[PDB]
Amino acid sequence: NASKLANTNVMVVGGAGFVGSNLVKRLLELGVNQVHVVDNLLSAEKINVPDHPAVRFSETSITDDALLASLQDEYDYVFHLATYHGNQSSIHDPLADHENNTLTTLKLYERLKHFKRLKKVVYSAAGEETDIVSLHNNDSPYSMSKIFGEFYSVYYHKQHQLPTVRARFQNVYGPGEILGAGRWRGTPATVWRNVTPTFIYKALKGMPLPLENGGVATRDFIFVEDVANGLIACAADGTPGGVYNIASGKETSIADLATKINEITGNNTELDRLPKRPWDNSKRFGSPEKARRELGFSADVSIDDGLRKTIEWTKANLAVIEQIMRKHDSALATYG
Amino acid sequence: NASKLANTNVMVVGGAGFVGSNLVKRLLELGVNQVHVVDNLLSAEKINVPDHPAVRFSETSITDDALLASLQDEYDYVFHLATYHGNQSSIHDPLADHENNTLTTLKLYERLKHFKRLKKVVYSAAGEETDIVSLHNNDSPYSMSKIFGEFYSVYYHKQHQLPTVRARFQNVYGPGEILGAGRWRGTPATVWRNVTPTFIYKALKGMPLPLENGGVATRDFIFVEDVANGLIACAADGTPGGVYNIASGKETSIADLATKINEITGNNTELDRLPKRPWDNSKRFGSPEKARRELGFSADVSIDDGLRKTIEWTKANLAVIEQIMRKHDSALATYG
Ligand SMILES: NC(=O)C1=CN([C@@H]2O[C@H](COP(=O)(O)OP(=O)(O)OC[C@H]3O[C@@H](n4cnc5c(N)ncnc54)[C@H](O)[C@@H]3O)[C@@H](O)[C@H]2O)C=CC1
Ligand SMILES: NC(=O)C1=CN([C@@H]2O[C@H](COP(=O)(O)OP(=O)(O)OC[C@H]3O[C@@H](n4cnc5c(N)ncnc54)[C@H](O)[C@@H]3O)[C@@H](O)[C@H]2O)C=CC1
Numbered sequence: 201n202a203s204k205l206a207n208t209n210v211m212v213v214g215g216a217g218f219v220g221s222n223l224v225k226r227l228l229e230l231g232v233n234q235v236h237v238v239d240n241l242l243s244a245e246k247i248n249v250p251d252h253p254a255v256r257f258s259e260t261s262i263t264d265d266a267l268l269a270s271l272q273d274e275y276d277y278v279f280h281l282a283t284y285h286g287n288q289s290s291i292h293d294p295l296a297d298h299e300n301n302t303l304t305t306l307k308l309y310e311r312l313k314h315f316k317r318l319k320k321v322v323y324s325a326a327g328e329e330t331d332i333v334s335l336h337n338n339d340s341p342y343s344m345s346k347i348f349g350e351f352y353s354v355y356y357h358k359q360h361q362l363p364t365v366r367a368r369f370q371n372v373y374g375p376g377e378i379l380g381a382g383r384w385r386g387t388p389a390t391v392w393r394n395v396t397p398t399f400i401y402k403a404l405k406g407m408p409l410p411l412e413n414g415g416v417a418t419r420d421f422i423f424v425e426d427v428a429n430g431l432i433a434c435a436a437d438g439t440p441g442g443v444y445n446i447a448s449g450k451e452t453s454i455a456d457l458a459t460k461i462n463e464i465t466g467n468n469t470e471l472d473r474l475p476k477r478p479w480d481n482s483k484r485f486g487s488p489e490k491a492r493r494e495l496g497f498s499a500d501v502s503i504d505d506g507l508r509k510t511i512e513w514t515k516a517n518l519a520v521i522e523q524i525m526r527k528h529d530s531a532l533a534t535y536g
Numbered sequence: 537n538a539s540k541l542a543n544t545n546v547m548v549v550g551g552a553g554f555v556g557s558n559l560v561k562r563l564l565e566l567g568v569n570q571v572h573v574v575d576n577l578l579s580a581e582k583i584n585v586p587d588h589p590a591v592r593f594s595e596t597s598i599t600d601d602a603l604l605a606s607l608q609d610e611y612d613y614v615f616h617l618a619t620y621h622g623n624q625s626s627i628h629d630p631l632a633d634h635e636n637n638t639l640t641t642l643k644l645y646e647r648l649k650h651f652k653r654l655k656k657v658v659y660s661a662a663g664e665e666t667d668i669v670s671l672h673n674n675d676s677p678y679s680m681s682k683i684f685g686e687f688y689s690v691y692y693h694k695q696h697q698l699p700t701v702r703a704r705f706q707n708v709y710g711p712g713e714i715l716g717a718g719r720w721r722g723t724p725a726t727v728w729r730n731v732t733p734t735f736i737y738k739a740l741k742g743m744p745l746p747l748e749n750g751g752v753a754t755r756d757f758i759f760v761e762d763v764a765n766g767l768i769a770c771a772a773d774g775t776p777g778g779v780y781n782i783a784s785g786k787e788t789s790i791a792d793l794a795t796k797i798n799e800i801t802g803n804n805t806e807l808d809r810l811p812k813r814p815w816d817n818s819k820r821f822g823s824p825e826k827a828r829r830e831l832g833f834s835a836d837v838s839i840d841d842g843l844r845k846t847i848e849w850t851k852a853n854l855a856v857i858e859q860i861m862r863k864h865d866s867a868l869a870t871y872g
Contacts, residue, residue: 263649291695298642306634344687351680354671359627445559 201429201497202436203230209275209317211236213262213308214282215243215371218377219324219427221248222281226256226428236275238262242300243285243382243390245524262304273315277435280308280323283342285385285393290342292386301345305352313360315414320363320435323353327370327420327486329443350443357441365412365438367431368486369446373397374424374506375513380525386533391528396507399458400514401521403465414474415455420485422448423506433495445486448499460504464511537766537833538772539566545611545653547572549598549644550580550618554713555660555763557584559615561766564590572611574598578636579621579718581860598640613771614686616644616680619678621721621729626678628722637681641688647862649696656699656771659689663706663756663822665779686779693777701774703767704822709733710760710842711849712872716861724871728862732757732843735794736850737857739801750810751791756821758784759842762835769831781822784835796840800847824844 210227214220215237220246224235228250237249240261249257260267262282282304284290290297305323312321326346329355338344349366356362373396380391392398399409430446438444455473461469491497501509514521545803546563550556551573557580560571564586573585575599585593596603598618618640620626626633641659648657662682667690674680685702692698709732716727728734735745766782774780791809798807827833850857 294642294646298639302638303634306630310630333669333671335667335669335686336694338687338691341691344684344691347687348684350671350678351674351683355674355677355680358672 204436206275207431208277209234209235209236211238211278213238213278213280213304215239215244215279216241216244216249216257217281217285218381219372219424219431220244220279220281221376221430222332222374222424223281223428224250224255226425226432233348238267239282240464243385245378245381247520248376248378260265261300263299263307267492268307268311271311271316275315276317276319278318278321278326279435280305280321281430283324284345285382286388286389287340287342288389289385290340290345291448294341294383297341297345302348302432305349309352309356309362311324312378313362315505318363320365320440322365322367322431322434322438323349324431325366325368325443327368327445327447329368329445329486329490331443334443346355354441361440363440365434365440366443367434367446368424369427369430370486371419371421372424372427373421376424376523378521379404380521380528384528384531388532391525391532395454396457396510397514399461399498400465400511403461403467404511404514404518406467406469408469409458409462409467409471411454411458411472414472415453415458416474416476416480418451418453418476418481420448420451421457421503421506422446422499423501423509426501430491430499431495433491433497437495439494444491444495445488446497446499447486447488449488450503451485452503460507461511464508540772541613541768542567543569545570545572547574547611547614549574549614549616549640550677551575551584551615552577552580552582552593553617553621555635555708555767556580556615556617556762557712557766558710558760558830559617559764560586560591562761562768564588568767570829574603575618577718579721580637581714581717584712584714585857597636599635599643604643604647607647611651612653612655614648614654614657615767615771616641616657619660619707620681621718623678624725625678625721625722626676626681627658630677632721633681637678638684641685643770644864645688645692645698649692649698651801654699656701656774656776658701658703658767658770658774660767661687661702661704661779662684663704665704665781665822665826667779692776699775699776701770701776702779703782704779705758705763705766706822707755707757707765708760709757710846714762714857715861716857716864720864720867724868727861727868731790732793732846733850735797736801736847739797739803740847740850740854742803744805745794745798745803745807747790747794747808750808751789751794752810752812752816754787754789754812754817756784756787756834757793758775758782759837759845762837766827766833766835769827769833773831775830780827780831781824782827782833782835783822783824785824787821787841788839793839796843799846800844
């Protein structure tokens with residue numbers, strides 16, 4: 201963690217997004233001097249970027265040449281969270297993915313490489329830590345772009361001493377993830393972004409939660425405020441050139457996720473759940489041990505507590521979320 | 537190999553370059569129906585693209601949107617040889633590298649992905665074959681771009697059945713590599729492209745050949761006509777989704793390279809050579825066994841025979857080469 205961030209100047213690329221908006225909130229709580237949010241709103245809503253005396257917002261792509269040339273060596277920390285959201289959208293259009301997922305990292309790093317005030321540049325990568333990768337089983341252009349940004353992070357550190365730290369995480373959930381956020385990116389996943397907000401929304405509407413294959417799939421969910429603190433710990437204390445898993449270390453099946461959401465929301469509809477078998481998940485989830493040992497970081501928000509917090513926020517904001525989702529009604533109808 | 541290529545339509549992206557020009561010559565010998573060379577001449581000379589009834593030349597980047605949209609499903613084979621030449625230039629300007637080394641592959645594959653006449657798409661990658669890669673020890677943006685094109689090759693095959701074959705090679709030498717070819721790409725390596733043509737040129741001029749560290753470094757040199765035949769064997773018979781080393785399997789030290797070039801040219805000047813020790817090369821060169829077994833391909837041109845052929849060509853073309861090199865005199869003078 202740290203008050204190492206108190207009174208500092210920070211840039212959050214992708215800072216209007218789900219993880220980004222939460223990181224910005226936490227940085228302001230820690231008393232940073234300035235946050236420069238650079239976000240084109242491609243998969244985000246402007247209501248997630250506060251109008252705050254300490255927040256500067258550039259509604260602009262990080263690949264923009266003018267914006268890049270305008271940047272000054274006035275930042276202590278940079279968090280690079282931009283992506284092309286997400287797997288499905290990237291498959292639909294690999295060139296839209298490349299512009300907003302691969303080239304973003306390269307152009308940013310190229311601009312930052314001779315900056316001297318920078319203490320750390322933290323890159324959100326996809327989830328002990330190894331730096332060996334296979335050419336196979338990269339299911340999407342998104343997955344490749346995330347790996348490519350790790351390659352860039354290592355290169356700019358070795359060649360130009362850019363103080364990069366790669367933070368690998370997965371299955372983040374919590375307040376601030378808005379179904380339908382941003383522009384239509386090609387597929388229904390623009391609306392139905394991820395399983396948790398989908399289930400919470402449908403449960404709040406009293407609808408049956410669709411389980412694929414009885415919900416035997418397991419995931420290591422992590423609450424977004426823990427991810428924000430993990431990213432801050434990487435910034436403050438992560439080793440330049442290094443990589444850390446930011447992970448809960450706890451697996452929850454989709455069936456149990458749905459069960460919990462139904463019980464918290466009062467959704468009395470049926471669940472077509474099946475018993476998990478040894479072949480259903482035969483594999484790898486990230487160990488949280490390195491971050492615990494080196495950074496003193498642990499993601500301790502339980503799936504029960506994180507879900508209550510998320511549902512509370514979703515309830516309070518349901519009308520706003522519904523209006524955002526509805527902008528895609530026509531695209532949703534045309535799809536396929 | 538094959539007459540599988542007789543009477544076919546072929547595209548050679550990067551076909552005005554060193555390996556590309558040699559491949560085009562060999563394809564015409566094998567009686568292809570048409571060769572479409574797409575080359576922006578960034579590191580090539582127009583004199584390497586013949587004015588032939590069977591050759592169409594598009595002096596255009598493969599990333600050009602209009603060019604890409606204009607392409608028709610009229611190709612049996614595509615060879616993707618374009619790159620940003622080379623390591624040093626890419627370090628000087630990673631964004632010039634990305635445009636001409638990473639984005640080239642993605643935009644090409646995106647255009648080709650629904651073409652139905654395609655039998656094989658052969659990608660020149662950098663050098664038994666494994667598909668595991670490290671984030672470390674990628675010394676340049678060039679090296680990363682070459683690996684990224686392997687990622688793309690695997691993805692487009694799995695997702696869209698694009699019939700890709702990755703051909704890994706290194707240390708190609710021979711006729712058609714012109715010192716100073718193309719535009720100034722930032723550094724003296726635009727002129728002094730590689731050790732072999734550098735040594736041949738200097739030897740022909742009666743100059744001492746500079747050895748770094750007594751020339752203890754070893755390389756697996758491969759003659760360019762063998763590489764052209766290797767690429768053709770990949771096209772004809774390589775497994776879609778697969779990868780093959782196109783390699784000589786024989787190591788030559790830089791000292792022996794220089795010795796041979798001096799002896800063939802009659803260069804009587806001194807050589808500051810040192811004995812090779814076990815720590816000088818402690819590592820990995822590609823095994824040629826898979827290509828031998830699956831494709832019936834072996835690169836059998838010896839370093840002695842290939843060097844004679846290369847020197848003969850360089851002598852015959854020295855005036856033309858000198859004029860090409862001289863275009864960079866001013867840039868060379870300003871450098872650093
Ligand atoms: N949410 C999750 O479970 C996981 C997230 N990640 C990574 O975390 C980071 C944040 O992702 P989320 O907040 O979940 O998604 P998000 O889509 O809410 O956030 C990404 C932000 O990037 C912005 N953006 C897109 N293109 C841009 C460009 N050219 N210039 C500037 N900004 C741009 C979007 O408008 C959006 O605000 C991403 O890098 C993502 O790959 C990694 C693993 C898991
Ligand atoms: N020569 C060697 O020892 C090795 C070569 N390679 C690979 O072999 C391929 C051929 O390389 P060489 O012939 O040695 O170099 P080269 O520089 O002579 O050939 C590359 C060609 O690509 C063209 N080009 C550059 N940007 C382009 C763009 N946007 N669109 C179209 N064409 C473009 C250049 O003008 C040049 O004619 C490259 O992919 C290279 O990475 C791989 C390992 C070793």
